[PDB]
Specification:
The complex is a heterododecamer, with six copies of chain A and six copies of chain G.
Chain A: no helix or strand
Chain G: E1 10-20, E2 24-30, E3 33-36, E4 39-46, E5 55-56
Classes of the chains: A little secondary structure, G mainly beta.
Subcellular location (chains G, H, I, J, K, L): Cytoplasm; Membrane; Nucleus; Synapse
Protein name (chains G, H, I, J, K, L): Alpha-synuclein
GO cellular component, one term (chains G, H, I, J, K, L): axon terminus
Chain lengths: ~10, ~10, ~10, ~10, ~10, ~10, ~60, ~60, ~60, ~60, ~60, ~60
Amino acid sequence: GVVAAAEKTK
Amino acid sequence: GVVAAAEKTK
Amino acid sequence: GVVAAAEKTK
Amino acid sequence: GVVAAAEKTK
Amino acid sequence: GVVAAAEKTK
Amino acid sequence: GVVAAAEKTK
Amino acid sequence: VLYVGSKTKEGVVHGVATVAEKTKEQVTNVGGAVVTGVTAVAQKTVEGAGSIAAATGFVKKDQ
Amino acid sequence: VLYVGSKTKEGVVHGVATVAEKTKEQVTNVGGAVVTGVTAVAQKTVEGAGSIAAATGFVKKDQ
Amino acid sequence: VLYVGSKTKEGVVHGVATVAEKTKEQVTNVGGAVVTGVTAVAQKTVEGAGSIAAATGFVKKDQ
Amino acid sequence: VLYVGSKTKEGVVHGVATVAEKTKEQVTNVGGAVVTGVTAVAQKTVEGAGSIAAATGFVKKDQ
Amino acid sequence: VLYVGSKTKEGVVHGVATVAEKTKEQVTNVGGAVVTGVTAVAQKTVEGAGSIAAATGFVKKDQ
Amino acid sequence: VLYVGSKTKEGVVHGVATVAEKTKEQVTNVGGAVVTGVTAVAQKTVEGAGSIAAATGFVKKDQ
């Protein structure tokens, strides 16, 4: 169940 | 179940 | 159950 | 009386 | 009376 | 009476 | 005098002048592979497979 | 005098001048691989597989 | 005089001048691998697999 | 805001990569001038005469 | 805000990479001048004459 | 805010990488001048004449 979410909400 | 989501909402 | 979430909300 | 002789006899 | 002789006899 | 002789006889 | 495989010059790089004036550079990888900016690289493989700037997205050999 | 595999020059890099004036550089990896900026690299593998700037996203050999 | 595998020069780097004037540099890794900025690297593997700037995201060999 | 002679960039050299692999170099001067190998040189003279790689054999202003 | 002659950049050298692999170098001067190998030089003269790699053989102003 | 001659950068050298692999170097001067190997030099003269790598053979101003 690999998950690598990422966000850069400015 | 590989997932690699990514977002850059500015 | 690998999870590597990351966020940079400015 | 400038003189600037030069030789390269091999 | 400048003189600047030079030789390279090999 | 400048003189600057030079030789490299090999 | 034999010179068996001798006096050689194999997989060689020399005399390389490079100038890279870039104002902005940006790589964004989301899954997969990215190879960027290989310069002046020399290799010599013997009895093996030698890549240099290979990139593979993902090998999925399930079961 | 034999010179068996001798006097060689293999996997060699020399005389490399490089200038990199970059005002901004940015790598963002989210899963996977990123290889960036390999310069003046020399290798010599014997009886083996030698890569230099390989990149693989992810090997998934389940079961 | 035999010179069996002698007088060689293998996996060598010399005479490397480098200038890197970067105003900003930024790497952001979220899972996976990032390889950045390998310069003037020399290797010689014998009877083995030798990589230099390899990157793999993640090996998942469950069961 | 005036910017009188400002924000300028005058007599400037940047980002210069050079490689000179010469096996033999030889200068032989017998009287006179020899100028050899000027690289990446910047000057700014004000109210004056500015040379960079001038060469004169001999000034002979007798009497 | 005036910026009279300000924010300038005058007589500047930067980001210079140089490699000089010379096996033999030889200068032989017999009377006179020899200038050899000026690299990455910056000057700024004000109200004066500024040379950088000038060479003069001999000034002979007798009487 | 005036900035009269301010915020400047004059006669400056930076970021200089140099490699000089010379196997033999030889200077032989017999009378006169020899200037050899000036690297990364910065000057700023004001109200004066500023040379950097000048060479003069011989000034002979008899009487």
